[PDB]
């Protein structure tokens, strides 16, 4: 029911069909029960119909070292739309669904478990979204600039890991750090690289860091444009700037290769201020 | 001495023109004489020269009165064309300090064709999708955008090749716009002239493509 009420068996009334099914979900559903708690068959039929539309990715590596992806990236834009579906289904129903809006020890883990694979469900649409981002770039090119330990990583890094495990997000974290930094060598756009890991895979980027990389990008094209005499003086203040905002939450790592560059365009006095600003934002209270 | 260091460095200039007037020689070009100085101040200056240079580097009528130049309308046309090829020029030199940081650094590099040029101007002025654009992409930016900023920056043919890979999309824009780079003076034909502004103002006059307004 759960399946035809998303869509499932339409690519064969229909919309009478899919609001019987809805019908069919929500009243024979079930609850849940003391027995440790017993979740309503809602709950299964839900977890089952999940699971089924990501079985073959689960326990799937990402990626196949000439670095390639395990699974082709048609197939994860059909997953990816079904669990869309699903998760659109279970808001446009969050008044009518048992479980879902929040309700005595029964209906409350029957609200953590709706929750808990809610969050799956999201996770796994921004899971699926990085995959297909990191492809669009060059990988190889990206996995060649890279540490041992996190070549590694990615080389046995699986869809579960990537979707429910901190590791995953720790290396998600690493690799747009690392994409964005090859974009701006490319240098087609950054801003546009920048709206695109803002929103759709947001909770796991950070704001701090497109700003961060929108900093990098003048410095970078900074040194791109390192013979011109007038129009760096536009591009470094741009990135000074830039990075003062996000003062309170730079990385050493970050803030090095920036004093870094600033010293091949002899930014002398200028790199000193950004130091001196991270510090202070680093400890207000002195 | 009452002469700031600029302004010494100007009477030494205007010593020399005197003093090839005072000896009959060859009349120099006194716009030189006046740059020459300029590049040893700010950019601030030696920009304004190129002006004058280029506003003033006209076919004139050698001994004739300075109203009667003027006033004819053909030379109040070659100004227009002057001042034109400065602005698309220098608006090129924007694009340039835009995509690199400084002139050098494009120079050392090469200086990419108008047409890759104004494609990675693109990248950074709108990085992300206008919804209201129209006519779709080419090579992966607004075919509209590509257009006017290749005649912002002045090279019709880098347009017309924007033109060329999306004959399909564009209608009958192609056998109009091949007219306005024929034509000399940026002007079309009364007749095509009158075909494509009535088509504008009939439909297009609020069109959520603000580039291909501006076309």
Redesign the interface.
């Known amino acids: 029911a759960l399946a035809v009420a998303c869509g499932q068996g339409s690519d064969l009334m229909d919309r009478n069909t899919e609001n019987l099914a809805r019908a069919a979900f929500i009243e024979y559903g079930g609850q849940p029960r003391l027995a440790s708690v017993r979740l309503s068959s809602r709950h299964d039929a839900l977890a089952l119909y999940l699971t089924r539309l990501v079985r073959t990715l689960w326990k799937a590596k990402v990626v196949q070292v000439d670095i390639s992806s395990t699974i082709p990236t048609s197939k994860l834009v059909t997953i990816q739309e079904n669990v869309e579906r699903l998760r659109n289904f279970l808001e446009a129903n969050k008044s009518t669904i048992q479980g879902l809006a929040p309700p005595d020890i029964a209906n409350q883990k029957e609200h953590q478990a709706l929750h808990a694979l809610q969050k799956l469900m999201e996770s796994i649409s921004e899971g699926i979204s990085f995959v297909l981002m990191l492809f669009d770039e060059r990988v190889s090119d990206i996995y060649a600039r890279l540490d041992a330990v996190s070549q590694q990583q990615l080389k046995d890094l699986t869809y579960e890991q990537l979707f429910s495990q901190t590791p995953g997000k720790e290396l998600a974290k690493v690799l747009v750090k690392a994409i964005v930094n090859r974009n701006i060598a490319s ?10 890991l803002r929103r759709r895979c947001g909770s796991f980027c950070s704001p701090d860091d497109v700003v961060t990389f929108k900093a990098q990008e003048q410095l970078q ?12 003086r ?3 203040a741009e990135s000074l700037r830039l990075f003062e905002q996000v003062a309170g939450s730079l990385t050493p790592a970050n803030l090095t290769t920036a004093v870094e560059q600033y010293i091949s365009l002899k930014y002398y006095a200028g790199a000193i201020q950004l130091c001196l600003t991270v510090a202070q934002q680093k400890d207000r209270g002195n | 001495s009452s002469l700031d260091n600029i302004e010494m460095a100007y009477a030494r200039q205007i010593y020399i023109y005197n003093e090839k007037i005072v000896n009959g020689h060859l009349q120099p070009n006194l716009v030189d004489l006046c740059a020459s100085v300029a590049e040893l101040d700010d950019k601030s200056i030696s920009d304004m020269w190129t002006m004058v240079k280029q506003m003033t580097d006209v076919l004139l009528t050698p001994a004739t009165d300075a109203l009667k130049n003027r006033s004819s309308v053909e030379v109040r046309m070659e100004f227009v064309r002057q001042a034109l090829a400065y602005l698309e020029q220098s608006y090129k030199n924007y694009t340039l300090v835009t995509v690199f940081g400084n002139l050098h650094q494009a120079q050392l590099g090469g200086v990419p064709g108008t047409y890759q040029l104004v494609r990675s101007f693109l990248n950074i002025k709108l990085p992300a999708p206008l919804p209201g654009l129209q006519d779709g992409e080419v090579e992966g930016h607004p075919v509209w955008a590509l257009i006017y900023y290749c005649m912002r920056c002045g090279d019709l043919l880098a347009a017309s090749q924007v033109v060329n890979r999306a004959q399909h999309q564009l209608g009958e824009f192609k056998t109009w716009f091949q007219e306005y780079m024929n034509s000399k003076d940026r002007r079309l034909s009364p007749a095509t002239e009158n075909k494509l502004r009535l088509h504008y103002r009939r439909a297009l006059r609020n069109n959520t493509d603000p580039y291909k307004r501006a076309v």
């Open positions: 240098g087609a756009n950054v801003e546009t690289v920048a709206d695109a094209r900074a040194s791109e444009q390192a013979h011109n005499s007038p129009v760096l536009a591009l470094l």
